[PDB]
From a paper:
KKT4 directly binds to microtubules and maintains load-bearing attachments to both growing and shortening microtubule tips in vitro.
To test structural conservation in other kinetoplastid species, we attempted to solve the crystal structure of the KKT4 coiled-coil fragment from L. mexicana. We were unable to obtain diffraction-quality crystals of fragments that had the N-terminal residues of the microtubule-binding domain (115–140 in T. brucei). Instead, we crystalized and solved a 1.9 Å structure of LmKKT4184–284, which corresponds to residues 141–244 in T. brucei. LmKKT4184–284 has six regular heptad repeats from the N terminus to Q224, and after that point the helices move apart and lose their supercoiling as observed for TcKKT4117–218. Interestingly, the end of the longer helix, which contains extra residues from the expression vector, makes seemingly stabilizing contacts with other molecules in the crystal lattice, which potentially explains why our attempts to obtain diffraction-quality crystals for the proper construct ending at Q284 failed. Superposition of the coiled coils from T. cruzi and L. mexicana revealed a good structural match with a root-mean-square deviation (RMSD) of 1.03 Å (for 123 Cα), confirming the conservation of the coiled-coil structure in these species.
Numbering used by the authors:
A (entry chain B): 182 to 258
B (entry chain A): 182 to 291
Write the structure that this text describes.
Amino acid sequence: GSTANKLTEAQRRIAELEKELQRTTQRVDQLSDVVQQQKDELQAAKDRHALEMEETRHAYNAVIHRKDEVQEEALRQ
Amino acid sequence: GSTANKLTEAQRRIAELEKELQRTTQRVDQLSDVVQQQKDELQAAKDRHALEMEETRHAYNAVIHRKDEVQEEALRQLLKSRQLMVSAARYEAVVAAKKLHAQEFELGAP
């Protein structure tokens, strides 16, 4: 085949490869976005659990303190 | 000439693109693997958090309940002890007031 014909075919293949590289690169960035969203969600869940655990511990400690005080006042009286 | 040179240039550009596509398609796969692992991780974490929260609440609650039980029984025993001291003092006061009044009355007999 002629050199010119080969060039036309090479130019077609370039255009085809560019399209496919664009498509695949677009998917990389979409997946990178999912990865970060998942990381944010995992931290958010950990933060929510820690907050619930801490609210519950403060409540327990307050109740123990309160019941000690009441008992103390009962025994002083 | 020019035609041949442009073909050589195009062949190089094809080789560059093919290698970039290979790398990009590998990155997609690496990211796809991360996405699935993070899904599994998220669920595992939610399950651990829920179990930990439930066990923690039950432990606090069992300790609070035992504290109420032990404290209330401490008062109940103290209050029973007081009721006994008082029922005995009250009986000892009738007994002594009766004895005193009988002695005073009797001393006055002929």
